[PDB]
From a paper:
LDH and MDH are homologous, 2-ketoacid oxidoreductases that share both a protein fold and a common catalytic mechanism. Both enzymes are found in central metabolism: MDH catalyzes the interconversion of oxaloacetate and malate in the citric acid cycle, and LDH converts pyruvate to lactate in the final step of anaerobic glycolysis. A key event in the early evolution of the Apicomplexa was the acquisition of a malate dehydrogenase (MDH) via lateral gene transfer from α-proteobacteria. Following a gene duplication event roughly 700–900 Mya, one copy of this MDH evolved a novel substrate specificity to become a highly specific lactate dehydrogenase (LDH) that is now essential to the life cycle of many modern apicomplexans.
In order to understand the structural changes during evolution that shifted the enzymatic substrate specificity of the apicomplexan dehydrogenases, we determined the high-resolution crystal structures of three ancestral proteins bracketing the key duplication event: AncMDH2, AncLDH*, and AncMDH2-INS. Each protein was crystallized with multiple substrates or ligands (lactate, malate, and oxamate inhibitor) and with NADH (resolution ranging from 1.35 Å to 2.05 Å). Unfortunately, in all crystals with malate, the malate spontaneously converted to pyruvate and/or lactate via redox reactions and decarboxylation. The alternative AncMDH2 (AncMDH2*) differs from AncMDH2 by 27 residues; the alternative AncLDH (AncLDH*) differs from AncLDH by 19 residues. AncMDH2* is a strict MDH, and AncLDH* is a strict LDH. The ancestral AncLDH* and modern apicomplexan LDH structures are likewise highly similar (RMSD ∼0.8 Å for the loop-closed states), while sharing only 63–71% sequence identity. The first shell active site residues are identical in the AncLDH* and modern Toxoplasma LDHs, comprising the same residues as the apicomplexan MDH active site with the sole exception of position 102, which is replaced by Trp107f in the LDHs. In both the ancestral and modern LDH structures, Trp107f and Arg109 are the only residues from the specificity loop that interact with the substrate. As in the modern LDH structures, ancestral Lys102 does not interact with the substrate but points away from the active site into solution. In contrast, Trp107f is buried within the active site, with the edge of the indole ring interacting with the pyruvate C3 methyl, which is the very chemical moiety that distinguishes pyruvate from oxaloacetate.
Numbering used by the authors:
A (entry chain D), B (entry chain A), C (entry chain B), D (entry chain C): 5 to 328
The structure:
């Protein structure tokens, strides 16, 4: 009587397929790979189905161009949209140039979620992340706690990796957060970086790392997306983005109460409301179950507010289109 | 001081990166992504490094364009090559058309394995699989038991998947083997298909599956690679090929004594010698530890011989190109 | 909101605690450890809770002496009862001697399952297995397909282990089944043993194993439980029994459609009905979804019938106790 | 040529067996279960071998009464000892009471490690922990960095569990350390407790947890071992101790560079030397690679010094017994 969890991946591109692969490997549930491109998602679904046999896991992987197949989905993860705006080089790529392109897609997707799986937990990945999640939320009519954006987990995992590498410790034992908008005004929280709860400052004071190296890592974290785009030559990152979204999905599916930075609907926290922005949150069976309001210093609070200001800017541009 | 296992991936494209992802997820050991394309492997290595942080695993992922970095690898997995021959068409995709382009790449890679990592266990993926592994082996100087080709695990995973699908059981509990050349004359062994050891014939007698349905599944298995190419539009399968090769690498790294079908150097088994072709084998810490010689019926033996003949015919082309 | 799966373990002894540990490690769901012994399950639940933190899993483990706490359990696994009959030596240890003691306990548990979690999938472990599961089913009023006994997965795992050990191959690649009653008259199906679908017979001919060795392995499988008892000195096996029951529980919870040998309610299969006996079955979200009827030879069929008669002998003793 | 890792467990009791189970589930390497009791480890090894087949893992489990079988071990984990001093009661259970019984055992074990596997990484569990590891180290001749005691990971996991429970978040996201002696004077470092790097102090201010609740948890953490002893009625904890020890073993075997609190040989850190005591350490392929010196406050430093003093006093008892 109790069926497997159902996870619909709206967008079967690099990140879409990669998330499906994680689902197959982890046996998270049945997977629906949706895309507007004909044949391709069916192709990937076949490949993934074969991969599940190798993994000795029990997972149906379905490729589709029909929104009807997302019916009854427990989780929906959205990557539909463009990665690199047309006519832009590698060394000038920006998430903000995509807004006119991707906003209309979020409406169509939101509308379809509304009628096929209105009780799904929905994770948005499409850029510009923080406004795309807002557009999705509006047109889907979903509860504020059942929709969020993936960015913070990815930005934070990068911050963690860079710190872990410099200190030569397991990234499991580094805690680091990046809050705010997903972009150049993201706010890596150096003051909150710990090694198993030990303040990063203790490693400074002990000369395991210098403040200047920390400053460089902060900058590298902010630019990490572009760094990868430049090195690859084609497209952008997808391994860590896929893993990031699936960590959020697992938190929901198994009611884990993970503390993860996600793009969450604010209802007054940090003195802001009516937008999604990167904040630490408790993720569980009820979606975004809690937004944690950090005791930011005035300096930190100003960086966050400037970050939120960027989102506000894009939001008007969205308003000057016609997507409620 | 016992270091982590070191796995070098020669070729950092679709399958290479995907394999590196599994290594990160599974914490198999440190990964070197080698490619001739500048910067791209470094870019992917960054993305994969970030994903390892998310996975809470402890894995070093290095992107490189220098064969020196493969020194002392425990396992080397080779994907270097073209996926589709230049100037060809989708429905006309053939593994054989890659022979003249990929043959010389196998010579180059072999020469470099010879000098930098002669003690590695080497898994070849590059198509056309069975002759590519021969070129690699010949030019690398490695022992016969330390080189093999990934094909049988993938072909068998497909055969298993389709059987499991039709019978509606877990693929874990379906045993199916495909032997011979990795191409149109591969031999799906219907007589050897079992469900937890229960012969497929019992399911036929009990009317759970028909001979006609089995026949369709046999042909579908043969055409699976091309089916995916036609659907994907760009490139060929990579999720299952990646998983297959890593299953083989795991068998070596942890001396598992897995029974896997791989392209192995024959020394009289099945009445054939001095070529690589798909056969059931025991894989462990000594590489291809044992080729299993199945009690084939005359009909099966003839199918196998015709399969081997295709490898011999491809070999004539290798010889005529002057690639040994 | 969707809650985590809930698994109630009725009996918190060795097997009970061990299953709880697997649950914590695998994050299968929240665990309730029930026992009539005061304080002990609370103590184990604390210990296990700490182990879940170490494992980075998200699992509540609750020890209890009250049946109310099994409310809403998705799976119930029952180990309540004695392991050894009082006034019996190890060399005379017999599962049959546990009957009058454990029969009455199965009645109580079934009554409590009826009122507290009538929709659970129930796995009985308590000996004498095949008749204990019938008692439990009778007094629980549960559907025939939602109750079964763990025995065949354990007996088969032993058969597999001993075969794999002799052939020196991965137990993953050995398929072996033991059907019939869980006792001296269990039936290890030598004819159905395969190595990745390859009949064991081929390895006899190829000289990797002899019929004499196989015969001795059959005997060792039958005696495996008593062999461990004699070696241990106190109680009986628990690591493999726990793992066997959890494998069954996982098949249900994730609707895997695994082919596992379990003690299942027969309704005409093999020419028998209205008793539980070990047979191959497909386990999924609807419990015992299908009982597979093997094409046993007359000789095999006679061994199985003899096995079934042993269950009937025990059953008649149950009738004596005046418990319907 | 490259063999599986080899892990020897000196002591095949509750914790020994449980650790072997984890090795089997995780496929960490082959396992030797050593004990002075005849037949018992052989019995457990069989049970565990069967469970490996169920897990589809590839692990040899060997029971023995001969030290010769621990030769070539990569890791050795020692649980040889009594759990409760004879003549004593549960409520008055004290690890210190075990000293005169287990000290001579550590000498015996140490002597045998000296001659059979001097190159192993050795983890001691036997109580009283901090002085038992010292006796073992003294009589084994091993390097200072290749020997340590399991305590801090367990104490910390308990601290973590209790904090995570109260705040209703995943224990993955709670960082908490307990340093010092493994006993009543252990030091749960409240100041260093974080939720993904967020200081616990913020949660106090935001009214998510009270100082009173924290004080209770600190006491509960100190008393946790005795709490379980009282509840179980027999023996002491084993699920979490086994897991803690395996976490340490994994960190070594795969060179993970984990930050874990372990009883480590001090050489001037914190102002102390030549004793083992619980401190944060980096564990990797070189064993105890680094002892981290925390910037303790003067109050915290006093607690730690008082904790170290307890070890010194236990050490006085060792010398008085005639065990150096
Ligand atoms: N069953 C099987 O055996 C399968 C085989 N394949 C084969 O695997 C190969 C790779 O497939 P994908 O990873 O999808 O292709 P891909 O095109 O994504 O990656 C191939 C990579 O090899 C690199 N390369 C080219 N020359 C090289 C050299 N001399 N040394 C090192 N690297 C070099 C390229 O720069 C490219 O990044 C193809 O030959 C394909 O036919 C693919 C799927 C299944
Ligand atoms: N946090 C910690 O450090 C913890 C420490 N412990 C300690 O771990 C030790 C073992 O606990 P359990 O496994 O539960 O006890 P157990 O009584 O179940 O097993 C102890 C085993 O050691 C064996 N043994 C005795 N003398 C020996 C010798 N000379 N050589 C080899 N083996 C010998 C016994 O035969 C017995 O099987 C105890 O000393 C206990 O106090 C237990 C829990 C947590
Ligand atoms: N931190 C982050 O949030 C993060 C990280 C990486 C990428 N991204 C973003 O995620 C998105 C996906 O990236 P990718 O690498 O998978 O790109 P991709 O080009 O590989 O995938 C996009 C897919 O969406 C499909 N698509 C386009 N319009 C659609 C519609 N109306 N309905 C359904 N599908 C449609 C395309 O056919 C394509 O397959 C991009 O917008 C990218 O900017 C975000
Ligand atoms: N193949 C198999 O099916 C298989 C394998 C191993 C053991 N077993 C059987 O499984 C059972 C459990 O074995 P074990 O090693 O866990 O024994 P154990 O003695 O360690 O555990 C039995 C537990 O059941 C409890 N109990 C007794 N009456 C109860 C009641 N009315 N309600 C709740 N709990 C009650 C006891 O207090 C004890 O904690 C035994 O009957 C044994 O014969 C079966």
């Amino acid at each position: 009587m109790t069926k497997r969890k159902k996870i619909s991946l709206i967008g079967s591109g690099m990140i879409g397929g990669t998330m499906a692969y994680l689902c197959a490997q982890k046996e998270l549930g049945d997977v629906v790979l949706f895309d507007v491109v004909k044949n391709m998602p069916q192709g990937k679904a076949l490949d993934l189905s074969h991969s599940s046999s190798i993994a000795d896991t029990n997972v149906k992987v379905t490729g589709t161009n029909s929104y009807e197949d997302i019916k009854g989905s427990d989780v929906v993860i959205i990557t539909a949209g463009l990665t690199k705006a047309p006519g832009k080089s590698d060394k000038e790529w920006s998430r903000d140039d995509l807004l006119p392109f991707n906003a209309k897609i979020m409406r169509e997707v939101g509308e379809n979620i509304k009628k096929y799986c209105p009780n799904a937990f929905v994770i948005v990945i499409t850029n510009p992340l923080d406004v795309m999640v807002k557009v999705l939320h509006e047109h889907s009519g979903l509860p504020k706690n059942k929709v969020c954006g993936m960015a913070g987990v990815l930005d934070s995992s990068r911050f963690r990796h860079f710190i872990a590498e410099k200190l030569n410790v397991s990234p499991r034992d580094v805690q680091a957060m990046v809050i705010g908008a997903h972009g150049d005004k993201m706010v890596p929280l150096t003051r909150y970086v710990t090694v198993n709860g030990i303040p990063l400052q203790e490693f400074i004071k002990k000369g395991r790392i210098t403040q200047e190296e920390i400053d460089e890592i902060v900058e590298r974290t902010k630019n990490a997306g572009g760094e990868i785009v430049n090195l690859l030559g084609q497209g952008s990152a997808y391994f860590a983005p896929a893993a990031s979204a699936i960590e959020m999905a697992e938190a929901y599916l198994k009611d884990k109460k993970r503390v993860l930075v996600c793009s969450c609907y604010l209802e007054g926290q940090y003195g802001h409301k009516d937008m999604f922005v990167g904040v630490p949150a408790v993720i569980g069976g009820n979606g975004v179950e809690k937004v944690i309001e950090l005791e930011l210093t005035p300096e930190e609070k100003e960086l966050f507010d400037k970050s939120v200001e960027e989102v506000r800017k894009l939001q008007k541009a969205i308003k000057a289109l016609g997507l409620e």
